Amino acid sequence: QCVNLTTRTQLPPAYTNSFTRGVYYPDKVFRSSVLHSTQDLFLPFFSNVTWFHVIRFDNPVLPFNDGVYFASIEKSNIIRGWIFGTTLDSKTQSLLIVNNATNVVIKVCEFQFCNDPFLEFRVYSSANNCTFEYVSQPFLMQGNFKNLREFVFKNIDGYFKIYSKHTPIIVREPEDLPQGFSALEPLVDLPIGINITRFQTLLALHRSAAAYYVGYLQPRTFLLKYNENGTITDAVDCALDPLSETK
Amino acid sequence: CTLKSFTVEKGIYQTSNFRVQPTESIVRFPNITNLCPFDEVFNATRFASVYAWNRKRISNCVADYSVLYNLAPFFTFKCYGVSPTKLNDLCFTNVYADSFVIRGDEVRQIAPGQTGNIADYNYKLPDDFTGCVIAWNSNKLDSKVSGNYNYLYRLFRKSNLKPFERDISTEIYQAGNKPCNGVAGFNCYFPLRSYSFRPTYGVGHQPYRVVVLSFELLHAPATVCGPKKSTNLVKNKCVNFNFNGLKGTGVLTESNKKFLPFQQFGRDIADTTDAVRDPQTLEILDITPCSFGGVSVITPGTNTSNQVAVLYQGVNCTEVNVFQTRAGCLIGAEYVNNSYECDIPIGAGICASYQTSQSIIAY
Amino acid sequence: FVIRGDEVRQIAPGQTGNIADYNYKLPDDFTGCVIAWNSNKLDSKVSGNYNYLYRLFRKSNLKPFERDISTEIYQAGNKPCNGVAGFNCYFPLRSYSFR
Amino acid sequence: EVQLVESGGGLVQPGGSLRLSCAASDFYFDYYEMSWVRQAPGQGLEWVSTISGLGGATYYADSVKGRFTISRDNSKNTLYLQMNSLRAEDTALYYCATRSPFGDYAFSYWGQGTLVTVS
Ligand SMILES: *[C@@H]1O[C@H](CO)[C@@H](O)[C@H](O)[C@H]1NC(C)=O
Ligand SMILES: *[C@@H]1O[C@H](CO)[C@@H](O)[C@H](O)[C@H]1NC(C)=O
Ligand SMILES: *[C@@H]1O[C@H](CO)[C@@H](O)[C@H](O)[C@H]1NC(C)=O
Ligand SMILES: *[C@@H]1O[C@H](CO)[C@@H](O)[C@H](O)[C@H]1NC(C)=O
Ligand SMILES: *[C@@H]1O[C@H](CO)[C@@H](O)[C@H](O)[C@H]1NC(C)=O
Ligand SMILES: *[C@@H]1O[C@H](CO)[C@@H](O)[C@H](O)[C@H]1NC(C)=O
Ligand SMILES: *[C@@H]1O[C@H](CO)[C@@H](O)[C@H](O)[C@H]1NC(C)=O
Numbered sequence: 126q127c128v129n130l131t132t133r134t135q136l137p138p139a140y141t142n143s144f145t146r147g148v149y150y151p152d153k154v155f156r157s158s159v160l161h162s163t164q165d166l167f168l169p170f171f172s173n174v175t176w177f178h179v180i181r182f183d184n185p186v187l188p189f190n191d192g193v194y195f196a197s198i199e200k201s202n203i204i205r206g207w208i209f210g211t212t213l214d215s216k217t218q219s220l221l222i223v224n225n226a227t228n229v230v231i232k233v234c235e236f237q238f239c240n241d242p243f244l245e246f247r248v249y250s251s252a253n254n255c256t257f258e259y260v261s262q263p264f265l266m267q268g269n270f271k272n273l274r275e276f277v278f279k280n281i282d283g284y285f286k287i288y289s290k291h292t293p294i295i296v297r298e299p300e301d302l303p304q305g306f307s308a309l310e311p312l313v314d315l316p317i318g319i320n321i322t323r324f325q326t327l328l329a330l331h332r333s334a335a336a337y338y339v340g341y342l343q344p345r346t347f348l349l350k351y352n353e354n355g356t357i358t359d360a361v362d363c364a365l366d367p368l369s370e371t372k
Numbered sequence: 373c374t375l376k377s378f379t380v381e382k383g384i385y386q387t388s389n390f391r392v393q394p395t396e397s398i399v400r401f402p403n404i405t406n407l408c409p410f411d412e413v414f415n416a417t418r419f420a421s422v423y424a425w426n427r428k429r430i431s432n433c434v435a436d437y438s439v440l441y442n443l444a445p446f447f448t449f450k451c452y453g454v455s456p457t458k459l460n461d462l463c464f465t466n467v468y469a470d471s472f473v474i475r476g477d478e479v480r481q482i483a484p485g486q487t488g489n490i491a492d493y494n495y496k497l498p499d500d501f502t503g504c505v506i507a508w509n510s511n512k513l514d515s516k517v518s519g520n521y522n523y524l525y526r527l528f529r530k531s532n533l534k535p536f537e538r539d540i541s542t543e544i545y546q547a548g549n550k551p552c553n554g555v556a557g558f559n560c561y562f563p564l565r566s567y568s569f570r571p572t573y574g575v576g577h578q579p580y581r582v583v584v585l586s587f588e589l590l591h592a593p594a595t596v597c598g599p600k601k602s603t604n605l606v607k608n609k610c611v612n613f614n615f616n617g618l619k620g621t622g623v624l625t626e627s628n629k630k631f632l633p634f635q636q637f638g639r640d641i642a643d644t645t646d647a648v649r650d651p652q653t654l655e656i657l658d659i660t661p662c663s664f665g666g667v668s669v670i671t672p673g674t675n676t677s678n679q680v681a682v683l684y685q686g687v688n689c690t691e692v693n694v695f696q697t698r699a700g701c702l703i704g705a706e707y708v709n710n711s712y713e714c715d716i717p718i719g720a721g722i723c724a725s726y727q728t729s730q731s732i733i734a735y
Numbered sequence: 736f737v738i739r740g741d742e743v744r745q746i747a748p749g750q751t752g753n754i755a756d757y758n759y760k761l762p763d764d765f766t767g768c769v770i771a772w773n774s775n776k777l778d779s780k781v782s783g784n785y786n787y788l789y790r791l792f793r794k795s796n797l798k799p800f801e802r803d804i805s806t807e808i809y810q811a812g813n814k815p816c817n818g819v820a821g822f823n824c825y826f827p828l829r830s831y832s833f834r
Numbered sequence: 835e836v837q838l839v840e841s842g843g844g845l846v847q848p849g850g851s852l853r854l855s856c857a858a859s860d861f862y863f864d865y866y867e868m869s870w871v872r873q874a875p876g877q878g879l880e881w882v883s884t885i886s887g888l889g890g891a892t893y894y895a896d897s898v899k900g901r902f903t904i905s906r907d908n909s910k911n912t913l914y915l916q917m918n919s920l921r922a923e924d925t926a927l928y929y930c931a932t933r934s935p936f937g938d939y940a941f942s943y944w945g946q947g948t949l950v951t952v953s
Binding site (some may be wrong): 427429431453465468498500501502503534535536537586587588589590591592609 | 862864865867869881884887888889891893934935936937939940
């Protein structure tokens with residue numbers, strides 16, 4: 126059974142630009158030394174992404190228009206899943222991804238999710254009739270190191286595509302999206318298509334330092350260069366500057 | 373024919389295009405994983421009784437009838453409606469498997485049309501039955517020398533009822549019009565017959581696990597299909613490849629293109645399929661069409677002779693005297709080491725002529 | 736010939752059904768004209784009209800421009816009826832009902 | 835041969851309900867299978883739903899997945915049809931046909947059928 130925590134107010138969020146991050150693989154085709162022009166939903170370069178920081182319980186409901194770019198600079202795995210739904214009224218189907226101790230469990234159901242879900246899963250109490258369940262054992266995860274987890278959630282023509290990327294990052298000056306290329310790989314292609322309009326995250330409080338950068342996608346044409354080993358090394362936005370559109 | 377004239381002048385003329393035709397029809401479909409649970413009907417617990425014979429809705433799966441083999445020496449493969457083989461090329465919308473154990477002395481009773489005492493009071497099979505009936509002895513794992521009463525059946529019945537329904541009602545029986553009405557004595561016994569399976573008994577009335585597979589087909593789409601082709605992989609030749617969704621013609625070879633775990637296919641500058649991945653056995657190939665080119669006929673003129681030379685543009689004299697040049701493979705001319713004036717231009721510094729018997733030369 | 740009212744659509748190139756597959760099939764390159772007209776006053780009486788026959792069961796689909804006047808019994812199952820017209824041996828030609 | 839009748843309504847408003855009943859008797863129904871097959875005015879035939887006699891599993895059409903449900907009463911040897919959320923383009927004369935699963939794809943017997951129009 127859920128319980129509304131006490132002493133929790135609201136906090137005005139901030140905004141920060143994305144340093145050429147949020148570029149995934151459009152299709153499952155292998156190419157080398159090819160400059161391909163795609164017209165898929167990508168993240169525009171230098172976009173004002175939020176800067177939800179937790180050190181203290183930032184978990185607001187955010188709109189899901191066409192795509193979500195979810196970054197996480199963590200070291201102790203603070204966040205452990207997400208929740209997607211259009212009304213959150215225990216009436217229609219809603220997607221839930223929760224990280225276990227050794228696996229990831231994804232459900233399509235209408236559990237009794239309350240206003241303030243937080244983490245053994247005390248976020249819901251009952252389980253209605255579900256249409257899809259998936260348990261994936263390989264889940265999704267030295268002192269002077271940190272973990273950067275990139276995720277791209279898209280919902281087009283029914284299939285909810287989930288791209289992921291894991292990388293080690295050095296603890297720099299106050300955290301922000303670092304510079305470089307990531308090339309998120311396709312991870313999940315669930316047989317789904319229920320309507321999704323809003324979403325939220327899932328924290329983990331172990332009662333005896335993290336930040337996410339939720340962004341929004343939009344239709345854009347990108348120019349991707351494939352290397353000889355089959356990975357993308359750079360990307361042109363084609364709608365950023367006169368130089369970017371003349372290249 | 374290509375010049376629309378009966379008098380061809382001296383010169384080289386390209387007539388048509390040469391292209392090698394494929395030989396095989398390799399498919400290479402993936403390893404099915406959604407197999408049907410046929411082990412919970414055969415390799416399940418001992419068995420179900422014949423008065424409450426159960427069957428599950430075996431639908432929406434891929435039932436491979438080859439996993440049923442490699443077991444106890446099951447004989448009497450008597451199936452009706454369809455041949456014992458060729459089941460892997462048909463799909464029924466539903467399959468129902470029955471599990472019940474009766475005496476093996478008159479197992480011929482379990483068949484369309486045949487009636488009697490076992491196949492009448494316990495479980496009758498209609499004359500129209502396209503399923504598959506099989507049987508096998510299981511006395512080595514379903515017997516014990518004390519008296520085996522773990523399987524019961526029926527003896528008292530008035531008439532023959534409808535087919536294909538379970539008979540669990542065991543109300544009191546009447547052999548005539550005697551108003552017994554709950555006495556439980558002579559001529560009014562309890563309607564329930566029992567068994568006795570002992571290894572000392574002969575092969576006649578020993579327990580026999582029998583299973584019938586009724587293949588029910590409706591207007592619903594076919595769900596229970598069988599295995600697919602999954603042909604062998606033969607490379608180093610032009611084959612008709614028939615992969616999951618990438619069909620076509622071309623040669624297959626070993627490729628060094630290191631694919632990614634999620635990538636399955638590969639394109640090129642011309643947006644054409646270049647490399648593929650064999651689903652069942654992870655191995656990257658390279659789709660390349662076989663040798664093709666244009667045929668050009670060098671003719672010294674129909675007025676003077678009728679001999680011709682054939683030049684295939686873009687070959688290597690290894691797929692069609694012959695002469696390998698930088699333009700193809702000339703067949704019909706003799707490469708003379710001398711050098712004359714270029715009469716019929718062929719290419720790459722090589723030309724042809726009709727010089728002295730009379731034969732076409734290349735120089 | 737004479738058909739039903741709802742079965743007039745099946746008399747067309749490409750259309751399938753019961754009359755266009757077992758009685759009269761038109762080819763895809765049919766260069767002709769179909770002309771139909773109701774005959775409820777000349778082919779119908781209030782007594783029970785059963786003087787018009789049609790085929791319901793056949794082994795395969797009838798090819799274009801083929802007349803099947805045979806009377807071989809059908810077999811809806813696997814029982815060798817060998818000409819008895821009984822259970823699973825339905826008669827291939829049944830009569831209409833025009834009221 | 836043996837053939838029986840089917841009754842019910844003949845007209846229903848676009849949003850009401852109707853209970854069609856195909857009444858059979860003197861037939862081997864429990865091992866046979868039944869189905870409804872509609873016919874749009876001016877069009878061909880279309881399979882609506884089907885029920886079996888062996889296990890009783892029902893199978894509906896993709897257009898009537900969440901609007902049509904049927905149930906066979908073995909005690910009365912009749913087939914019911916309870917239609918929900920009747921739209922304006924579902925008007926068709928429903929035929930009550932039964933066939934044997936261990937045969938071919940041809941319907942054995944055809945019912946009388948009745949046209950039900952919606953406003
Ligand atoms: C992001 O929004 C903030 C507040 O509106 C603004 O100060 C900042 O300049 C914006 N940055 C970009 C990249 O537009
Ligand atoms: C965690 O893993 C166990 C074993 O698979 C599973 O039974 C349980 O449902 C999982 N818990 C969650 C978070 O659903
Ligand atoms: C699941 O339950 C909800 C609420 O009762 C219902 O609206 C939905 O149609 C159900 N889905 C299934 C799988 O029956
Ligand atoms: C690709 O792999 C080759 C061989 O390991 C290597 O030499 C080359 O530098 C790699 N290129 C990159 C950086 O993807
Ligand atoms: C039952 O077990 C045997 C032996 O392991 C096996 O060969 C067979 O495939 C299994 N499946 C069936 C038919 O139940
Ligand atoms: C496909 O099945 C074959 C036979 O068991 C097996 O050897 C092969 O590795 C399988 N491939 C995969 C990985 O699915
Ligand atoms: C033709 O084949 C020979 C022998 O394999 C090879 O040495 C030569 O390079 C080939 N030439 C062409 C045009 O491929």
